[PDB]
Ligand binder design. Structure first.
Ligand SMILES: *[C@@H]1O[C@H](CO)[C@@H](O)[C@H](O)[C@H]1NC(C)=O
Ligand SMILES: *[C@@H]1O[C@H](CO)[C@@H](O)[C@H](O)[C@H]1NC(C)=O
Ligand SMILES: [Ca+2]
Lengths: 105, 105, 105, 105
């Protein structure tokens, strides 16, 4: 981590020492981007994110990650609105507004 | 005024006839006028703060059921069970017989 | 689900091959429908439904700007919001949210 | 007195030499004297309320990193990263240079 802080990345993990056994189908990456991993990123796309890459467990390139840690296509992400979690294709209408959840937004 | 339960209803589809409960709100004056909110998706907030579950706080006890439904208990005389999709079951001990008011009678 | 042959008449509805195009007349109900040889639909609706109808054909009042009323009772500037608001599902076909297709121009 | 970080150290094995940090406590006087506690196992409490993440509350932001480590931010000038097992990294912007005090110098 100190090396990475100085911008040097070392592939030091190996089967004989300290492999990250990632949950479920997530894939270990030595340099992955955190900005667009979770489906909340879909629900809040205008929240700016410029964070550098980091090692960890990430979903495959075509899938986002939900609350359960399961990798899902963006069509299956829930939508977060006013702090409430709505399922895909959910619709609601209020005195003031009409909304519907699609593709995590 | 031991408790006070309020439901927020929204149109839940395109049809005018499709109206279902989005969120539930519970005042507990005897618990220093706490305000619990049971949200869509079975999240819980207390005094506006999203709380991690289970919550034990005096008489109040909020926890996930095996069905993933939030079960709220307060004392032994009041209980609630919120599935997050729109189903709410409120159970009162006989202690509240005749004392109750609202849509539930 | 039972197939029938033209011409057909029942319960005030008349199916006829008028002028080489499949007609479906509803004089009693105050409407006439037609499908031409190329698949273009047509609906003629009597004056009795002035300002009393709603659907993809819009309401029927000479003001054209207000035709996009959704089933929720609100106008929308997007044709697809309006149309998807007027979708109808069945026990063997549940409607997906339609969206504009990709195109070259 | 923009902030104040305190660590709770316990013996972390049988050996007298094995002492590691169990929990972290952060006071934020500008945020109405909020008292965040980063707990063992990467949980978080705020003013004694266990809280559900991500938390956005004024300048304070708390969220899970891809490593499951809790990352706390307060404005631009203070950041923390708590893995829950005993590793804590505190990053201060140059705004605090010379102003700091404690074990970190
Ligand atoms: C996230 O961003 C990266 C880099 O910008 C991109 O390769 C990837 O396709 C995006 N989406 C997901 C789900 O990772
Ligand atoms: C049509 O119906 C609406 C809604 O009831 C009403 O406000 C309006 O006066 C009616 N007539 C016309 C010409 O729009
Ligand atoms: Ca019109």
């Amino acid at each position: 981590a100190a090396c990475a802080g100085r911008g040097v990345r070392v592939a030091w993990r190996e089967p004989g020492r300290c492999e990250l056994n990632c949950p479920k189908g997530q894939v270990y990456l030595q340099c992955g981007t955190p900005c667009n991993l979770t489906c909340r990123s879909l629900s809040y796309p205008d929240e700016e994110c410029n964070e550098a890459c980091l090692e960890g467990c990430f979903c495959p390139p075509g899938l986002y990650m939900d609350e359960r840690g399961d990798c899902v296509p963006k069509a299956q992400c829930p939508c977060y609105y006013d702090g409430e979690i709505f399922q895909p294709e959910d619709i609601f209408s209020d005195h003031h507004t009409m909304c519907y959840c699609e593709d995590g937004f | 005024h031991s408790f006070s339960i309020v439901i927020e209803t929204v149109q839940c589809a395109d049809d005018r006839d499709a109206v279902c409960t989005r969120s539930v709100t519970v005042r507990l004056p005897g618990l220093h006028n706490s305000l619990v909110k049971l949200k869509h998706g079975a999240g819980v907030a207390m005094d506006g703060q999203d709380v991690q579950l289970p919550l034990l706080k005096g008489d109040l006890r909020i926890q996930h059921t095996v069905t993933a439904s939030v079960r709220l208990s307060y004392g032994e005389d009041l209980q609630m069970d919120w599935d997050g999709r729109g189903r709410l079951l409120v159970k009162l001990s006989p202690v509240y017989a005749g004392k109750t008011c609202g849509l539930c009678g | 689900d039972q197939r029938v042959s033209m011409p057909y008449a029942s319960k005030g509805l008349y199916l006829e091959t008028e002028a080489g195009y499949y007609k479906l007349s509803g004089e009693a109900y105050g409407f006439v429908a037609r499908i031409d040889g190329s698949g273009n639909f047509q609906v003629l609706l009597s004056d009795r439904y002035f300002n009393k109808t709603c659907g993809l054909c819009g309401n029927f009042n000479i003001f054209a700007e207000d035709d996009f009323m959704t089933q929720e009772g609100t106008l929308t500037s997007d044709p697809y919001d309006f149309a998807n608001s007027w979708a109808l599902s069945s026990g063997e076909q549940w409607c997906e949210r339609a969206s504009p297709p990709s195109s070259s121009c």
